[PDB]
Amino acid sequence: ANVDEAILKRVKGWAPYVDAKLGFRNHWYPVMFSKEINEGEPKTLKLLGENLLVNRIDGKLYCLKDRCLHRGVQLSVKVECKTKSTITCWYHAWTYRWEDGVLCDILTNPTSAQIGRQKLKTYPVQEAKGCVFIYLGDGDPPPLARDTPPNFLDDDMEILGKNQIIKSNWRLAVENGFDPSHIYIHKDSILVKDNDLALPLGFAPGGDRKQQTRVVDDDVVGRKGVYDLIGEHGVPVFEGTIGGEVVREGAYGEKIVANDISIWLPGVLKVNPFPNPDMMQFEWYVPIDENTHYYFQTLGKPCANDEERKKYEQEFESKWKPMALEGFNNDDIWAREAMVDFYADDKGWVNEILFESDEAIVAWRKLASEHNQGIQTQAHVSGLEH
Amino acid sequence: ANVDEAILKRVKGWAPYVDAKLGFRNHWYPVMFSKEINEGEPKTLKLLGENLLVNRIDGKLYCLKDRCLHRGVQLSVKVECKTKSTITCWYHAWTYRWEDGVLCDILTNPTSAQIGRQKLKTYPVQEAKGCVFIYLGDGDPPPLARDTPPNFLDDDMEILGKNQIIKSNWRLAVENGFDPSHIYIHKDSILVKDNDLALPLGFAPGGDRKQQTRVVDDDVVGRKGVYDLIGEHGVPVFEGTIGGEVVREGAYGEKIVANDISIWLPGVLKVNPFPNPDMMQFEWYVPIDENTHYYFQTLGKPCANDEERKKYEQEFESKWKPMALEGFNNDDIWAREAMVDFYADDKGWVNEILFESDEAIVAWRKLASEHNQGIQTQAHVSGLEH
Amino acid sequence: ANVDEAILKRVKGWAPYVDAKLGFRNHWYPVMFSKEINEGEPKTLKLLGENLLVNRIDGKLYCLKDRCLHRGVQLSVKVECKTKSTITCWYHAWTYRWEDGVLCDILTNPTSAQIGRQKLKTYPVQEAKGCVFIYLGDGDPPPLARDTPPNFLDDDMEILGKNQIIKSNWRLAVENGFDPSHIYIHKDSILVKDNDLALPLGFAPGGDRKQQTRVVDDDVVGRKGVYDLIGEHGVPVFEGTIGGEVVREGAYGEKIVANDISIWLPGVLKVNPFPNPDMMQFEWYVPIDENTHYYFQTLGKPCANDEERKKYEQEFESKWKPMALEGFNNDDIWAREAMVDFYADDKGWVNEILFESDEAIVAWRKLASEHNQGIQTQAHVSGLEH
Ligand SMILES: Oc1ccccc1-c1cccc(O)c1O
Ligand SMILES: Oc1ccccc1-c1cccc(O)c1O
Ligand SMILES: Oc1ccccc1-c1cccc(O)c1O
Ligand code: FES
Ligand code: FES
Ligand code: FES
Ligand SMILES: [Fe+2]
Ligand SMILES: [Fe+2]
Ligand SMILES: [Fe+2]
């Protein structure tokens, strides 16, 4: 659908992942924080190439396609919400219900035969952990847990975060995050010194292929992911040599982090524990279009009462956001950007030369290829045909 | 020629209009005001995708293609008019007559065999009502009146105006202007209050389909257009309801405007009377390229002597330009812009969902499809082949 | 390979030149001055569409493709030269030798099976006359002299220069430089007055076709070029007439320049003598990509000792650079730019209408078509396929 068929033949058995340049349909995706959208103040965003409107009405979130059925304009060019339950297109006043998208009135012609006989596309929206998730899919949504990493939705788990727009395809972001050897780029992070981390330069793998990862297709809520097990039979590399001469060393700190690393559909990474031995990082790479993604970062820490939550919030702001989310992950951002050119023409997928640690990524490409709930296409974006 | 043949099959009987993304050839178009081009001061513009040069020589206008026959450079990069009757290309001095475009000399080789045996394309130019019209066509031009709305060329009719470049396809501009229900966008215009207009929100049409418009193919000078007759059997809407609740009202002023509205080939709208009961608006949407048009606005008012003309000019400057041409039509401009995305891939023409007032636009699409004097193509732009 | 096959059929026997939009492979090209690259300070550039890294190591130049074999990132995003003889990719520390491009180590996995079994592309580099030349080709390079104009590599010849990036295809630059009638554009140059040059407006050619040029395929070092002989049987034009009236004259100075003019593969012009009767100009138009070239200007003057070289350098800086390289050749730059649009769609090659002086260019197109060492393609740029 999205990629030259000749390229897809050459990547037999990751073909669906390579074709998924616009992301996977029929999954939940986070797109903003609860606090960023107030009652009766609609917001625009693009998700899987589709312009959407989100509104809060009586505290509850509704999502409509931001495209009038009449002449295809964005309603958001000029929002006219003239009753709590509706939005009126600024152009000829076609009026839609937030709840089901039905065209319930037209101000310019209250006798039109279109009234009650057209419906704008809606998508389910759910808040959880102060995060807004949209189900960019058709039919009844699965439970959110299916599309979230283990422990993200535990009651005591306190989630704080940052979101921004990054100029790479979402897959470059996923692959970079789940890439065992990419740790090399983090070797000079401020967070490595100022939080005393142990961080290898890389890994000398051991064991067979299958032992490099755990493929999860047996989780009870239907989650699908891969654990990076390179450290189980593998030896960490702390001395980097060229011609046998030591030219770089890893970091010899006390704090042990990233005991478990896992990537889940539709494209969320869990690193545990990180950036501190008492915390978790969950980050999403959410497809906006083929060139762009939301880098939706969250840090989870169990909190037992309001006091622990106050405490957490204060170190999040003063330490963990500037030192980890920025000071550690900024390098991830420009690593992703550096892969764009080679993958832009879809040929990177056939001309890359992989090495042993890339077995984690291969396993993700196969898991995504097989367990995704649908390939988003340009036809989904441009609509059904009249 | 311009649009995927599969899309053209799906719009049977507006096909030629849908294909006409570069405009219609063999029509007159206004491109600037007389006063903007002085004796011996040539100007560049693009029209139907073609770069043109216009010059005033002994008070009379001449138009040449701004593209040297030799290496395809624009002569306008550096104009060398070295005799009244000629222009010399800055590059190898190939020299052309303004009057007929004939290559009459080459300064770099006065013995060249090309001399007298090559001719640059010319187009007829005519001034009328202080407006410059170019016939972007081949052969002897028709009379200007064919390509102008009724009454624009009456002797007493005093024409004043504004021109600018707008970033939409010309057809989006035409359709917006002739769109009976688009009046909704004008509901908050400064001109509606400060000139006390009656302005409905829209119309509940009545009568049959044929009664919604008058198709003119019987006018004596060969004009072809459509009158919007929605108001004849239709009821104006002044109260906009959602779920039966009044949420917006129209404007209840004294001044009656836009009794007659008509769109003519090649793409000029006449609204009478407007913006005042003693005036007319004629506005053109002139194709520059596929993404761009001149929004050539004029206001006509009968003046019987120099005194009335002085009077007119002074209210034009102080009131009608800032309050109407800008304060009313600015909303038209961004309405046109808002349609670009849906029509950019040529699919809007098949995926729009029209309603009853769009019968005016359908009638225009059929009139344009049938009575246009030619479809401009990329081959017209890039030239005949050697 | 690069141009619609239907266009190539229509230019039978310049087809290879018309297809060579990315330049000719298996030739030497100058890309920078010796002084611009210091010991251990690597530089990035693009040549024939390929991103390259150049380094100076123990005073000697090495060139590697700036593209990691692993995930296709540019090593130059963050250079890590951790031993004199190597460069380590910033991403997973794949480490390459400058000398042969062999992947000799990976810091992230010193046990990888890739080590010693992969090789990054290298290109030969040679300095001569304080100019850096790269052989953008495969196999053992020919001697540099093959790809340089006569006399450029004479021991006494002192070479000084300027380089910059110009936004046209390299062929527009070549053709402009070797274009006998383009001298018209130089008629108002500051250098024409302030250095008292004789400069015609153009030429009335005489003799037959073959006498307009000397095609050199008989030079002993394998050089291939064309001499412009228009002035041998031709008459210079000093009076430009329109309808027999003199409207422009040439320049009637004392200093005779440009007695011999020659264009050589891969695309270097020699004008002798110029810009002074005791000097030579050699300028290259080096393909960067399809839209861009290095305009690599040099002035050669025989110097017999360090004193003459000091003298030369001082007038180069104070006079010849600002007055000639800039004050004369700046017009060349915007002439080249003015041809871009007509040649952008590859149709200029069929729709141009040539005249008698263009016989020099035709002869160059045939010489290039026949004696080029290879056509650079997008496949050379994007690589061999896995
Ligand atoms: O993925 C990792 C491996 C080892 C140490 C830290 C990380 C890590 C944590 C959060 C986000 C990332 O991109 C990481 O690379
Ligand atoms: O087209 C109209 C319909 C009703 C009231 C005013 C206008 C009008 C007049 C001039 C230019 C326009 O775009 C209009 O919409
Ligand atoms: O090519 C030329 C012909 C006659 C006089 C000067 C030149 C010349 C010298 C150096 C570079 C150029 O582009 C020229 O046109
Ligand atoms: S485009 Fe929205 S009502 Fe017409
Ligand atoms: S391009 Fe105009 S004379 Fe050569
Ligand atoms: S991209 Fe260079 S080592 Fe991985
Ligand atoms: Fe990372
Ligand atoms: Fe309007
Ligand atoms: Fe020149």
DSSP string, B66-95: SS-TTT---GGGS-B--STTEEE-TTT-EE
Which of C317, C322, C330, C326 minimizes the C-alpha distance to C160?
A: C317
C-alpha span between B171 and B344 (Å, rounded): 12
Choose, out of C183, C245, C247, C365, the residue to mutate when testing the contact with B (most B CBs < 10 Å).
C247
Closest CA to B115 of B124, B130, B127, B102: B102
Do A16 and A82 sit in the same domain of this protein?
A: no
Chains that touch C (3 or more CB pairs under 8 A): A, B
Question: What is the DSSP-derived secondary structure letter of residue B143?
Answer: P
Distance CA(A21)–CA(A27), nearest Å, equals 15
d(CA B33, CA B35): 5
Return the closest-CA partner of residue B357 out of A77, A110, A105.
A110
Going through C137-211 in order, the beta strands assigned E by DSSP cover 157-162, 165-166, 198-199, 202-204
> What single DSSP character describes residue A322?
I
A-chain residues near C67 (CB < 8 A): 342
Residues with Cβ within 8 Å of C65's Cβ and at least 6 positions away in sequence, in order, are C50, C51, C52, C53, C101, C120, C121, C122, C123
Pair of tokens at residue A54: 């989100």
Spatial separation of the C-alpha atoms in residues B284 and B290, rounded to whole Å? 16
Could you tell me if C261 and C306 lie in one domain?
Answer: yes
- Contacts with B, A 98-127, CB within 8 Å: 104-114, 118
Q: CA nearest A211: which of A238, A178, A234? A: A234
Place of tokens 């000139």: B195
Q: Could you tell me the two tokens for C106?
A: 């990976």
- For residue B334, the chain A residue with the least C-alpha distance is A77
DSSP 8-state code for residue A324? I
Q: What is the DSSP string of C289-332?
A: ETTEEEEEEEEEEE-SSHHHHHHHHHHIIIIIIIIIIITTTHHH
State whether residue A17 is helix, strand or coil.
Answer: helix
Single residue among A89, A104, A138 that ends a domain in this structure: A138
Tokens representing residue B170 in the block: 């010309």
Measured at the CA of C308, the angle between CA C302 and CA C313, to 5 degrees, comes to: 90
- Check whether residue B153 and residue B130 sit in a common domain: no
Domain that holds residue B238: 4-25+139-383
Helix axes B170-178, B330-344, angle to 10 degrees: 120
Q: How many helices and strands (H and E) does chain A possess?
A: 10, 24
**Displacement of CA B179 from its chain's centroid (Å):** 16
Pair (B267, B375) in one structural domain: yes
Which residues of C are less than 8 Å from B49 in CB distance? none
Give the phi and the psi of residue A103 in degrees, each rounded to 5.
-70, 100
Beta strand pairing status for B50-57 and B43-47?
antiparallel
**Measured distance CA(A151)–CA(A66) in Å, rounded:** 34
CA A27 to chain centroid, in Å, comes to: 11
Q: Maximum distance among all alpha carbons in chain A?
A: 84
With a Cβ cut-off of 6 Å, ligand 3 is lined by C 177, 183, 258, 261, 271, 274, 281, 283, 329, 332
Ligand closest to A94 (CA) is 4
End-of-domain residue from the set C88, C107, C138: C138
Distance between CA B135 and CA C305 in Å, rounded? 70
Q: Of all protein residues, whose CA lies closest to atom 3 belonging to ligand 2?
A: B183
User: Which position has the token pair 């450079």?
Assistant: B73
Which of A51, A88, A137 lies closest to A372 in space, CA to CA?
A137
**Which two three-digit tokens encode residue C381?**
């740029």
Experimental resolution (Å): 2.3
- CA C61 – CA C47 distance, rounded (Å): 16
Residues B212 and B116 in one domain: no
Neighbours of C296 (CB within 10 A): 22
Q: What residues contact residue C187 under an 8 Å CB cut-off, 6+ apart?
A: C199, C201, C248, C250, C251
Q: Which of A375, A128, A11, A370 is nearest to A225 (CA)?
A: A370
Nearest by CB to residue A182, choosing from C72, C92, C383, is C92
C106–A338 CB contact, under 8 Å:
no
CA quadruple B159, B162, B168, B172: dihedral positive or negative?
Answer: negative
Do C72 and A339 make contact, defined as CB atoms within 8 angstroms? yes
**Helix or strand (DSSP H, E) at A260:** strand A260-264
Same domain, C70 and C144: no
- Neighboring chain B residues of C181 at a CB cutoff of 8 Å: 92-93, 108-109
Q: What does the alpha-carbon distance between residue A170 and residue A287 come to, in Å, rounded to a whole number?
A: 5
Note whether A334 and A237 are same-domain residues: yes
Q: Which of B87, B109, B377 to mutate to test the interface with C (most CBs of C within 10 A)?
A: B109
Please provide residue B174's backbone torsions phi and psi, each rounded to the nearest 5 degrees: -60, -50
User: Is residue A252 a known part of a binding site?
Assistant: yes
**What experimental approach yielded this model?**
X-ray
Residue A285: which region, alpha, beta or left (left: phi > 0; alpha: psi -120 to 50)? Answer: beta
Sign of the C-alpha dihedral computed for residues A14, A20, A26 and A31 taken in this order:
positive
Q: Does residue C115 contact residue A243 with C-beta atoms inside 8 Å?
A: no
State the Cα–Cα distance between residues B364 and B228, nearest whole angstrom: 10
* Residue C289, amino acid: D
Quick check: CB of B258 below 6 Å from ligand 2?
yes
Same domain membership, residue B370 and residue B281: yes
CB B50 within 8 A of CB B376: no
CA distance A175 to A123: 28
- Which residue lies with its CA nearest to atom 3 of ligand 5? B92
- SS3 state at A231: helix
**What end-to-end distance do the CA atoms of chain B give, in Å?**
20
Tell me which chain C residues have a C-beta less than 8 angstroms from the C-beta of A245. Answer: 83
Judge if C162 and C241 occupy the same domain.
yes
C8/C1 Cα distance (integer angstroms): 10
Question: Nearest C-alpha of chain C: how many angstroms from A276?
Answer: 24
Residues in chain A: 386
Name beta bridge partners: A204: A235
Per the CB < 8 A criterion, the answer to whether B92 and B108 are in contact is yes
C73 touches chain A (CB under 8 A): yes
The DSSP code sequence of B262-326 is EEETTTEEEEES-SSTT-EEEEEEEEEETTEEEEEEEEEEE-SSHHHHHHHHHHIIIIIIIIIII
Same-domain pairing of B152 and B296: yes
If asked whether residues B43 and B164 sit together in one domain, one would say no
**C74 touches A: beta carbon within 8 Å:** yes
Q: Of B77, B86, B112, which is closest to C242 when you measure between CB atoms?
A: B86
Backbone angles phi, psi at A326, to 5 degrees: -100, -55
Gap between the Cα atoms of A164 and A293, Å rounded:
8
Give the closest residue to C325 by CA, choosing from C276, C254, C291, C267: C276
Q: What are the DSSP E strand ranges found in C66-156? A: 86-88, 94-97, 103-106, 122-123, 125-128, 131-136
- Do C44 and C179 lie in a common domain? no
| Cα distance between residue C19 and residue C5, in whole Å | 9
Q: Considering its fold, how many domains does chain C have in total?
A: 3
d(C-alpha C154, C-alpha C131), whole Å:
14
- For ligand 5, atom 1, name the residue with the nearest CA: B71
Separation between Cα atoms, residue B198 and residue B236, nearest integer Å: 11
Using only the alpha carbons of chain C, give its radius of gyration. Answer: 23
**What span, in angstroms and rounded, lies between the C-alpha atoms of C343 and C339?**
7
Q: Does C243 touch chain B (CB under 8 A)?
A: yes
The amino acid at residue C255 is: K
Angle between helices C330-344 and C170-178 (to 10 degrees): 120
Within 10 A of B330 (CB to CB), how many other CB atoms are there? 12
